[PDB]
């Protein structure tokens, strides 16, 4: 059985996700339209909007708001791309191997992402990650806990209060394990599988950071990004 | 009568304008859509695109490309908003007191610009400038020469080679006067009128710079701008 303090954590995280993930994708029409690096303006607007959502979620994670502004920034700059990849699983479809967000205008395949600069060196492990993640059939409670665990990883560059961040992450990890054991039927190997996905994200973050440098170093491409994307994926230190 | 060297200048400037001002406004659909600071995303994309066009025109002005990179930047940062206001006259309509660029989606009135942050302190002198400019019934030759004279003003902050810039501007001014005298019937008071408009632009630039500081200082508004707008309207010095 799960305690009240562990339950209140789950309640806070599900509430946080429902407040920041818009299932209608209604705001997508406000982005620069997709062109089929023709896709870069639309996907830069998509990522920037998703960054704002990741900020909104993080602020609602118990304990995150108590960290210094510098620790809050260090965590977000390092984990933003990984949280984006995790939260994007909700629109991912096994039938099409694509992210579907409403109409055919907001359906993104592997080819749409190559038209944003990205290569198969990133897109092949990313699609393979999305399939493996979808196959886990995570309850929403597990999905939000994995995002919160990912965001509160103390082993990120720029992090100062490692102890406090580690104690917050340890507590989230305990909540997840206990949730899986008690509420997820036949989930004996699931916690191990979810932790492997966290390792997969570190590798996808590495490849993305490498590829990001390539477009950020070409001002004709970097000028197509948003000021928030530039700041969050930027190399600046607090 | 006008000389060959003066004619070649006119030919170069008209060619430059025809290569950088798209009369179809076909690219406007690629901007973040207008919302009726709801208008700020669309107008930021409009200004950024117009900045790229002003860069394209300036590079084709005889002598501009021979200036140092630092002088080229100093001129553009100081004059960009004034060139934008000048070139926008081509879409301006006396009948509607608005800039019309195709359909009703790309028709901007005084109210649309208030929805981009913003006030009548800028928009009332700007609309009054557009009306007075339209009333002059400038030939395209005069319009392109006024833009080139405006851009090559040596009395701009950051300018190093004042002498060379002044000699380029003096030569453009001579071309304009001689053009008006010989080719513009009943244009005896026109050159004086066009030079007054250049003074009006300095006042509109001042008010815009003041108002720009207001949105650039609020990160929730500044984040809606483009990296090119931020760099060009920015306070950074070479």
């Amino acid at each position: 059985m799960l305690s009240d303090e562990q339950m209140q954590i789950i309640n806070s995280l599900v509430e946080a996700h429902h407040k920041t993930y818009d299932d209608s994708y209604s705001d997508f029409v406000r982005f620069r339209p997709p062109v089929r690096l023709s896709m870069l303006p639309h996907l830069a607007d998509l990522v920037s909007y998703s960054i704002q959502k990741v900020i909104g979620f993080a602020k609602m994670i118990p304990g995150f708001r108590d960290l210094t502004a510098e620790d809050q920034i260090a965590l977000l700059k390092s984990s933003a791309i990984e949280i984006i990849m995790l939260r994007s699983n909700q629109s991912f479809s096994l039938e099409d191997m694509s992210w579907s967000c409403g109409g055919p205008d907001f359906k993104y395949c592997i080819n749409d992402v190559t038209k944003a600069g990205h290569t198969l060196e990133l897109l092949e492990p990313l699609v393979k990650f999305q399939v493996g993640l979808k196959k886990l059939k995570l309850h929403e409670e597990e999905h939000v806990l994995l995002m919160a665990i990912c965001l509160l990883s103390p082993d990120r560059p720029g992090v100062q209060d490692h102890v406090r961040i580690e104690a917050l992450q340890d507590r989230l990890c305990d909540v997840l394990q206990a949730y899986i054991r008690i509420q997820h039927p036949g989930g004996r190997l699931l916690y191990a599988k979810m932790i492997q996905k966290l390792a997969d994200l570190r590798s996808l973050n590495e490849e993305h950071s490498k590829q990001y440098r390539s477009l950020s170093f070409q001002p004709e491409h970097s000028m197509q990004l948003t000021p928030l994307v530039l700041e969050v994926f930027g190399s600046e230190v607090s | 009568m006008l000389s060959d060297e003066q004619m070649q200048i006119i030919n170069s400037l008209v060619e430059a304008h025809h290569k950088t001002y798209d009369d179809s406004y076909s690219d406007f659909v690629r901007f973040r859509p207008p919302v009726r600071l709801s208008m700020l995303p669309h107008l930021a994309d409009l200004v950024s695109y117009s900045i790229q066009k002003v860069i394209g025109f300036a590079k084709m002005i005889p002598g501009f490309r021979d200036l140092t990179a630092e002088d080229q930047i100093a001129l553009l940062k100081s004059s960009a908003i004034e060139i934008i206001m000048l070139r926008s006259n081509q879409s301006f309509s006396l009948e509607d007191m608005s800039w019309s660029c195709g359909g009703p989606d790309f028709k901007y009135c005084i109210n649309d610009v208030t929805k981009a942050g913003h006030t009548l302190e800028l928009l009332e002198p700007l609309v009054k400038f557009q009306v007075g400019l339209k009333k002059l019934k400038l030939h395209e030759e005069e319009h392109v020469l006024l833009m080139a004279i405006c851009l090559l003003s040596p009395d701009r902050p950051g300018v190093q080679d004042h002498v060379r810039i002044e000699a380029l501007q003096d030569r453009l001014c001579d071309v304009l006067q001689a053009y008006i005298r010989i080719q513009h019937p009943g244009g005896r008071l026109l050159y004086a009128k066009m030079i007054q408009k250049l003074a009006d632009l300095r006042s509109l630039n001042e008010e815009h710079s003041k108002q720009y500081r207001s949105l650039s200082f609020q990160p929730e508004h500044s984040m809606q701008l483009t990296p090119l707008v931020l760099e060009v309207f920015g306070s950074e010095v070479s």
């Binding site: 704002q52 900020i55 502004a69 920034i73 928030l228 700041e231 969050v232 607090s238 | 990160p219 929730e220």
Partner: peptide
């Protein structure tokens, strides 16, 4: 530094 981030992390 981190102008947008600092503002978004406020209230």
């Amino acid at each position: 530094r981190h102008k947008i981030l600092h503002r978004l992390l406020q209230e």
